Design a protein around this nucleic acid. Structure first.
Ligand code: K
Ligand code: K
Ligand code: K
Ligand code: K
Ligand code: K
Ligand code: K
Ligand code: K
Ligand code: MG
Ligand code: MG
Ligand code: MG
Ligand code: MG
Ligand code: MG
Ligand code: MG
Ligand code: MG
Ligand code: MG
Ligand code: MG
Ligand code: MG
Ligand code: MG
Ligand code: MG
Ligand code: MG
Ligand code: MG
Ligand code: MG
Ligand code: MG
Ligand code: MG
Ligand code: MG
Ligand code: MG
Lengths: 37, 261, 184, 32, 147
RNA sequence: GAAACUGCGAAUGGCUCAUUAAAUCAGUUAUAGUUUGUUUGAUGGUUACUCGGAUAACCGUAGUAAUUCUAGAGCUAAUACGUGCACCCCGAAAGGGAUGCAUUUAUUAGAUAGCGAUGAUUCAUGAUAACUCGACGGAUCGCACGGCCGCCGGCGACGCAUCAUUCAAAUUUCUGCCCUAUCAACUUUCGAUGGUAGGAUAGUGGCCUACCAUGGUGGUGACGGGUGACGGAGAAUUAGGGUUCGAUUCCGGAGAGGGAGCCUGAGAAACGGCUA
RNA sequence: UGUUACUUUGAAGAAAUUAGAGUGCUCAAAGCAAGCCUACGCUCUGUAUACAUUAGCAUGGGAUAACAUUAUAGGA
């Protein structure tokens, strides 16, 4: 039970981090538009 | 001493317990637990001195040994268990549920809760750091440790903790403009809006809080506890709502009460 | 017993300190280990404050020594204490203390060097050995002592505390410094 | 120690005199 | 060179015999000299970042942190090796007479080779862990007398 | 359910004020300089259908004037005691080595302005090479019985390890103490002040050792002497300022006829513990 | 960014004692209680507040005062 719990919680945390790495890049992409303007 | 002291003389007990000086030579020595001994309310005080369910030290043991009292959702049988700020005390037989909050005079008040609001509590984040295997974790000021916290949570933030799932439901960042309560010192129990943060390298950080009536008071960062984002707290406050009245104003109310009552 | 208190000392002004309490157990000291090089290994277990453990080595013969430039660590036999910066009497008594300069057997490192560089001091195997030989550099002073089978090493552990005698192989200007101290 | 103070005094006395020449030169040019 | 003791003096954790070069790496890595900032708004002297001395009690290149009380005073004695006596002058209030009396206290302090000091110079000292029987402070800044 | 083994406690409390004059102690600091049974929170890898030998109570031969003084014999238990299932390198890409946690050393990463924190740490933490003859990683107990066709499974108790927390300690920063100069120099061979390298310690430190330097304190009273001197919170009297007192119930310290030494333990230099 | 004293405000500060608010232990020294109506109870009942040398911490003030400094400007 505890090995599954540790493995489950570890997977969710990685999904959260990967899910937010897109924002740091997507938000960066739109942020670069100000430099051109 | 050659070790640990197991007794608390009655005159050395915290004043906010409001123990009578001639009631005996000793006061309940708070057990080790989530809260500090000087910033807690042992269950014996709650059951006997505040709620009057027990008349003696012995009767408190009978109540607790029947497993009738729960703190933060778990049954507690220790008479001197240190229940503290934001703790939820539940007594299923009486259908009662209280939250330990300070009144504006700095003393713990058993604020009756609704069944819906008794399913969570607020905790202040102490620190966030990497644990074994590089796994991040955060610990609070109520002794709790939460692994895999949201990366946005930082020290001094407040987290909403669900007592059933035992997980972080939501959190508030510590920043100017939020409503906070003072949990220590002269201004303990006062609620206001965090207006300013004065940092001093190597020294304590001072925070200037402004009451809803414009009264401004300062205190140390360690005595602040964010209650909500913006101006609305996430928890129900007692009648005073953290508004500290002057003695002149308080005497004015007492005089009027006798005229009406 | 041995005590680490300041009560017996003179004040910074020079005046004496009259005793106002007895010695405390929480300020005690203990007898030194005086670890010696000997094949009759002996490490005694000491119960210390908090119920924790210290390992007091009375005699040791082998140690875990690291070749820093090569990033390789091998267990090897301790042969001799040659230099000690604190007390030259610890050299002739062959006492093992932290920062003592000792000679260790070079055989375990020679085997790794031959297995790693294919040099004395299978088609896919020879492919990588020659690849690693491009960036191979060996200090002349460090190579000169491989012929004798002994490497100068410095003890980095505390045998009287951890019960072990670990260290690293001297090289660079540190090797030059100590070999000049031994040149007599 | 003696060399340390000699170099500082020798170099300080050098620029200390160069500045005096430069200020006088600048003053000469400002009059016109 | 700085090697004047019976043992070889070096900074802990700075490996000097690496095949790779230290060009382009932070202090204390790649064999580069290690130094740090002590915070509290104090600057790291150029003599400590570019020096060759070894001092494990130095606040900028050693293994001691500054925390506690920051004090100021005048150099009273600079005759020890890497240690000075700092004289702190203050007024003690005599209550009954509603007046003051001059008092002083001599505070031993460690001074790293990156600092130059003479009797009469003004020094700032920061508290550190016990370095000797009497020393609990480290010099952080020196102002020459008459400056 | 007596007895007995095992576990825990007996380091709190109570008593007293002898020693002690920058010492204790008070306010104020620091631990990035450490240990911490317990509480609370979290966290512990991909013969085994259950091992072994003892011992108490008990039983019965006793010794001694004698003591919770003591010897021998016969039995039998365990959560007692001792055991034991339990990515990188080499390489004809097979195969092999290492591969939990902890321990010890070394190399390496820990940026910038994928990549955490501080006023500030080569910090938290990661990876790698090895190391240790590692009290570690459950041979334990109660209650309830169910669900699948022998299998699976509930709620608890007790225990081991790691981090955080709590309960605390240890050491520690700054300032502050009565009378006395018919006490003016004191400290330093045998540590006095500082430096380097070690040893020891839970850990910092002349705490101790080796070597080196000659420092450290002082009419702003060092050093020494006196106290019918434990310190403080406080007490008496007080227009104000002040004078005197403070053994004693709260806090801190210290001691158990005088010294010293030590075992057990998370915690004692313990005295309703031991050794001289 | 010369360094301080002084002054202002604030934070932190054991309780007990002292001052002091509330309260008819029959009064009082005290104590920390109680009060309200007459129900299966209520007042979220109360258990305020000030003082607290000196030193330390942090804001505002800059008169008075102390120390430091000034011309081969190492000046802006
Ligand atoms: K103690
Ligand atoms: K015990
Ligand atoms: K103190
Ligand atoms: K005192
Ligand atoms: K130490
Ligand atoms: K030393
Ligand atoms: K114990
Ligand atoms: Mg006691
Ligand atoms: Mg700090
Ligand atoms: Mg027993
Ligand atoms: Mg005296
Ligand atoms: Mg002092
Ligand atoms: Mg690290
Ligand atoms: Mg040392
Ligand atoms: Mg010596
Ligand atoms: Mg007295
Ligand atoms: Mg006496
Ligand atoms: Mg007294
Ligand atoms: Mg007496
Ligand atoms: Mg008495
Ligand atoms: Mg007492
Ligand atoms: Mg004692
Ligand atoms: Mg007697
Ligand atoms: Mg004794
Ligand atoms: Mg007795
Ligand atoms: Mg006793």
């Amino acid at each position: 039970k505890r090995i599954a719990k540790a493995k489950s919680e570890a997977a969710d945390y990685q999904k959260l981090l990967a899910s937010r790495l897109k924002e740091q890049r997507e938000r960066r992409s739109e942020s670069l538009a100000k430099k051109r303007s | 001493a050659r070790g640990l002291k197991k007794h608390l003389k009655r005159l050395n007990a915290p004043k906010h317990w409001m123990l009578d000086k001639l009631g005996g030579a000793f006061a309940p020595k708070p057990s080790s637990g989530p809260h500090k001994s000087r910033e807690c309310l042992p269950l014996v005080i709650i059951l006997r001195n505040r709620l009057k369910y027990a008349l003696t030290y012995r009767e408190v043991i009978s109540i607790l040994m029947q497993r009738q009292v729960m703190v933060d959702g778990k049954v507690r049988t220790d008479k001197t268990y240190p229940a503290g700020f934001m703790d939820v005390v539940t007594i299923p037989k009486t259908n009662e549920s209280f939250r330990l909050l300070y009144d504006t005079k700095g003393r713990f008040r058993l604020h009756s809760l609704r069944d819906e609001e008794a399913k969570f509590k607020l905790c202040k984040v102490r620190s966030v750091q990497f644990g074994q295997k590089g796994i991040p974790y955060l610990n609070t000021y109520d002794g709790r440790t939460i692994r895999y916290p949201d990366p946005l949570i930082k020290a001094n933030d407040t987290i909403k903790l669900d007592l059933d799932s035992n997980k972080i439901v939501d959190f508030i960042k510590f920043d100017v403009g939020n409503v906070v309560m003072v949990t220590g010192g002269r201004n303990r129990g006062r609620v206001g809006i965090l207006k300013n943060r004065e940092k001093h390298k190597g020294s304590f950080e001072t925070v200037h809080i402004q009451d809803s009536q414009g009264h401004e008071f300062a205190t140390r960062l360690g005595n602040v506890f964010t209650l909500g984002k913006g101006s609305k707290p996430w928890v129900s406050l007692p009648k005073g709502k953290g508004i500290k009245l002057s003695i002149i104003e308080e005497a004015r109310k007492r005089m009027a009460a006798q005229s009406a009552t | 017993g041995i005590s680490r208190d300041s009560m017996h000392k003179r004040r910074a002004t020079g005046g004496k300190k009259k005793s106002w309490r007895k010695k405390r157990k929480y300020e005690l000291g203990r007898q030194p280990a005086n670890t010696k090089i000997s094949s009759n290994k002996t490490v005694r277990r000491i119960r210390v404050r908090g119920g924790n453990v210290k390992w007091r080595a009375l005699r040791l013969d082998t140690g875990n020594f690291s070749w820093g430039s090569e990033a390789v660590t091998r267990k090897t036999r301790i042969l001799d204490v040659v230099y000690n910066a604190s007390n030259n009497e610890l050299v002739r008594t062959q006492t093992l203390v932290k920062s003592a300069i000792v000679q260790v057997d070079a055989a375990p490192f020679k085997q790794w060097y031959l297995q790693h560089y294919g040099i004395d001091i299978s088609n896919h195997v020879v492919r990588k050995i020659e690849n690693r030989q491009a960036d191979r550099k060996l200090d002349s002073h460090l190579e000169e002592q491989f012929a004798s089978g002994r490497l100068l090493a410095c003890i980095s552990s505390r045998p009287g505390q951890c019960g072990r005698a670990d260290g690293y192989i001297l090289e660079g200007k540190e090797l030059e410094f100590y070999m000049k101290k031994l040149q007599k | 120690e003696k060399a340390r103070e000699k170099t500082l005094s020798d170099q300080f006395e050098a620029r200390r005199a160069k500045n005096k020449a430069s200020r006088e030169r600048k003053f000469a040019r400002r009059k016109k | 060179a700085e090697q004047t003791e019976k043992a070889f003096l070096k900074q802990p954790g700075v490996f000097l015999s690496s095949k790779k070069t230290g060009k382009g790496k932070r202090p204390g890595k790649g064999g580069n000299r290690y130094f740090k900032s002590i915070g509290l708004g104090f600057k790291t002297p150029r003599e400590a970042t570019e020096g060759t001395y070894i001092d494990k009690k130095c606040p900028f290149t050693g293994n001691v942190s500054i925390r506690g009380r920051i004090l100021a005073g005048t150099c009273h004695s600079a005759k020890m090796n890497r240690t000075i006596i700092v004289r702190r002058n203050y007024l003690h209030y005599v209550k009954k007479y509603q007046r003051y009396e001059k008092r002083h206290s001599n505070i031993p302090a460690h001074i790293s080779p990156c600092f130059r000091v003479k009797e009469g110079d003004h020094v700032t000292i920061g508290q550190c862990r016990p370095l000797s029987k009497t020393v609990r402070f480290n010099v952080l800044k020196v102002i020459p007398a008459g400056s």
